[PDB]
Design a protein around this ligand. Structure first.
Ligand code: DC1
Ligand code: DC1
Lengths: 219, 225
C-alpha cells in the first residue's frame, strides 16, 4: 500500500517530508492532524503513536514517528541510487549527523521558541534568550557551510531538506542578515522546484503564530 | 585505517551507550575525556572540533560525528558489518532508527532537562513534579513499545536498546518503574548482558556527582538493581 502521512504543514519537519515527497514524485495519502487544536492527542492517534508527534508515516505495518526516519525511509524506498541519502558510508554518516543536529539542536530551539509564543503570547516570551539560542544554531550552520555548497557536502542531501524548513521558520523572526553563507544557501534552496512545498505551510504558520501570539513578525 | 577516537564523559548516558557498543563489539578506540561538569566541552580546541559542545563525539579519520546515534550507527556499520544490531532488512532497520530518534528527541531530552535543572538550581529548587510528569510520559511510551515485542525495536537486541537503556537507567535513579512491568522486565534483561557492565561505572559516578552538585540523595528505592 502507499504511505500515509499524518501532517500539519505549519510544522517545519512536516514540510521537510512534503519537500521530499514532491522532489521524488511519491504518491502519498495525506491525513491532516491539527496541531493547534491538539488533535495529535486524539485517542486513535495516540494509539497509533503515543509520542503524539507529527509528521507520522504509516507504510504498511511500518509506523515512523520522526521526520528524520521518514526522510531516510522514503529516500531508501523511492530514491535508490540518489544523492539525497548517499551510498558512500562517510558521506551518509555526515548527512545522518546533520539530521540529528536538526533534531536535537535547530528544531529543538525553534520549537522551544515558537511553543513559548503559543503558550504565553509573544509579550510573555524572553525573546533575547531564544535569540541567543537560535543565533548559536545560525553560527554553527554558517561554519558547516564553509567551502561547501550544501549542508553535508557538494550535493543536495536529506540534511538540506530537513534544515531548510526549520531555517525558514526561525527566519520568520530572526534575520539571516549577518550570515552570508547561510543566506546564500537559503537563497539557493529557494530555487529548487521542490522548495515550493515549503511555501504554503510557512505562510500558514506565520498567520497562525501572529494570531495566537498577538504580534507581527519583523518585516 | 586510523583508529576511532571517542571524546567522552561516562556520566552521560549517550556516552555509556557508545561504551556498551564498543564493549559488545570489542572495538579498539582511543578514549579522550571531556569533563562536562568542569566545562571542558567549552575548551577552545573542543569547540573547534564540535561547536555543539557535546559528548559523545567521535573522530574516525576525517569523519567527525557529534551525536551518539550517528556514532552507534557508524560503529555498527564499520564493526558489526552484516550484523543484527543495525538490522539488514529495511523495515527492521527503520524501526531501530525510529526508536533512536525517540531517544534523542524525547527520552534523552527530558532526562537532560531534568538533570540540568538540578545542576543549575539545586535539587530542592527544581520543579520535580513537572519533570516527573515529563519523564513518566516517556516510561508510558516505552511500555507501549514493549507491549508489542520483547526488545524495543523487535524480537532481538538492537542499537535501539543500547541507546535507550543507558538513559532509562539514569532516569530511574529518580523515578521508579513499579508501574511499568514490561519496562522492568526489559531493563532486568538488559542488566544481564555482559555489555551492560559498561553502563554501571558511569551511572554510579553520575549518581555521586548529581547528589553532590545538587545537594540531595536520590530515592534509594527507585533504582532497579
Ligand atoms: C507548529 C509549530 C509550533 C510546531 C513546532 O514544534 C515548532 C514550529 O516551528 C511550528
Ligand atoms: C551528565 C548529564 C547531566 C548529561 C546530560 O545531558 C543528561 C544526563 O543524564 C547526565
Amino acid at each position: 500500500p502507499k504511505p500515509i502521512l499524518y501532517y500539519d504543514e505549519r510544522s517545519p519537519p512536516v514540510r521537510s517530508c512534503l519537500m521530499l515527497i514532491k522532489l521524488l514524485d511519491i504518491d502519498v495519502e495525506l491525513r491532516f492532524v491539527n496541531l493547534f487544536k491538539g488533535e495529535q492527542f486524539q485517542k486513535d492517534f495516540l494509539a497509533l503513536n503515543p509520542q503524539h508527534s507529527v509528521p507520522t508515516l504509516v507504510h504498511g505495518d511500518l509506523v515512523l514517528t520522526d521526520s528524520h526516519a521518514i526522510l531516510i525511509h522514503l529516500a531508501e524506498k523511492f530514491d535508490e541510487g540518489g544523492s539525497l541519502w548517499p551510498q558512500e558510508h562517510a558521506e551518509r554518516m555526515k548527512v545522518l549527523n546533520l539530521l540529528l543536529f536538526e533534531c536535537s539542536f535547530l528544531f529543538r530551539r525553534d520549537s522551544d521558541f515558537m511553543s513559548a509564543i503559543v503558550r504565553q503570547g509573544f509579550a510573555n516570551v524572553d525573546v533575547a534568550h531564544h535569540e541567543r539560542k537560535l543565533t548559536e544554531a545560525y553560527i554553527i550552520m554558517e561554519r558547516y557551510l564553509e567551502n561547501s555548497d550544501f549542508m553535508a557536502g557538494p550535493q543536495l542531501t536529506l540534511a538540506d531538506l530537513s534544515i531548510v524548513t526549520t531555517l525558514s521558520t526561525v527566519n520568520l523572526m530572526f534575520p539571516l542578515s549577518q550570515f552570508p553563507r547561510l543566506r546564500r544557501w537559503f537563497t539557493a534552496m529557494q530555487q529548487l522546484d521542490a522548495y515550493e512545498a515549503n511555501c504554503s505551510g510557512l505562510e500558514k504558520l506565520r498567520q497562525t503564530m501572529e494570531s495566537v501570539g498577538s504580534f507581527q513578525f519583523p518585516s
